Amino acid sequence: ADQLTEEQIAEFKEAFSLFDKDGDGTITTKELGTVMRSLGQNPTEAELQDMINEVDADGNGTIDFPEFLTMMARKMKDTDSEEEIREAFRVFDKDGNGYISAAELRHVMTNLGEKLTDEEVDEMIREADIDGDGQVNYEEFVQMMTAK
């Protein structure tokens, strides 16, 4: 899933509060780039003025956390975590066949540096009939690492 993890929501909530000097849980458009830049993102000025024209639909010129989360979810799209795991399994599809040996699959999940425990993968392997044949595609194992 591409849902915001409780952490990503907290990270943004902290970077957002960083400019909530009104104790109202909101920030001004003048600090929006600063908030976004606080997370290490550097959108151009036009990119910022473009999202403002839409967010500035109330005619007030301010951003609240909820709407701020609507911006983060619109950016963490084209860069899903899925494209990262599939691109890793791609690094493992040296034969461009779409299939690798479970070993390479288990290796793709460990080399990625994911905090997955060998036990969690053992369960993901139960429904992924990784036997009966010997090789398995990852598209199914990719959606499993994202969120059952």
Side-chain angles (χ1 to χ4, degrees):
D2 222 330
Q3 300 164 236
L4 293 161
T5 46
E6 300 191 356
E7 303 200 273
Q8 292 167 335
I9 291 191
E11 221 176 300
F12 305 161
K13 176 141 260 181
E14 320 228 316
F16 187 90
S17 41
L18 263 166
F19 311 76
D20 176 270
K21 303 277 186 151
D22 299 335
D24 198 333
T26 65
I27 60 180
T28 85
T29 40
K30 299 194 175 198
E31 306 155 315
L32 170 50
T34 325
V35 180
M36 280 269 204
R37 289 214 332 164
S38 86
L39 299 166
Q41 301 218 288
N42 184 321
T44 53
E45 284 192 3
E47 284 186 277
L48 282 175
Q49 288 258 50
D50 243 46
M51 303 194 275
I52 287 171
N53 228 66
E54 279 192 340
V55 171
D56 177 78
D58 201 57
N60 303 26
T62 52
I63 322 208
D64 66 0
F65 188 63
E67 299 163 313
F68 185 85
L69 286 198
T70 299
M71 293 232 242
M72 305 312 286
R74 283 256 277 161
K75 269 273 183 81
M76 308 241 282
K77 271 165 86 200
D78 192 1
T79 183
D80 202 0
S81 142
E82 248 170 51
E83 272 186 45
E84 296 220 325
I85 282 178
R86 182 223 299 312
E87 276 188 84
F89 276 114
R90 191 187 227 316
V91 150
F92 271 88
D93 176 12
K94 297 196 175 165
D95 201 52
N97 181 256
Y99 293 78
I100 51 184
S101 64
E104 273 164 313
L105 184 109
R106 263 143 116 316
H107 202 63
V108 173
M109 304 156 89
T110 358
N111 194 277
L112 270 168
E114 297 235 54
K115 283 158 154 174
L116 295 159
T117 56
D118 294 298
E119 294 108 49
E120 282 174 298
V121 168
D122 288 315
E123 125 174 37
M124 295 171 185
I125 287 173
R126 269 209 219 317
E127 282 181 358
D129 335 68
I130 279 226
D131 190 21
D133 221 301
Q135 314 202 76
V136 207
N137 116 311
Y138 29 99
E139 218 184 337
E140 274 196 73
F141 247 107
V142 177
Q143 297 196 13
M144 273 180 207
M145 295 230 290
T146 2
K148 287 63 163 74

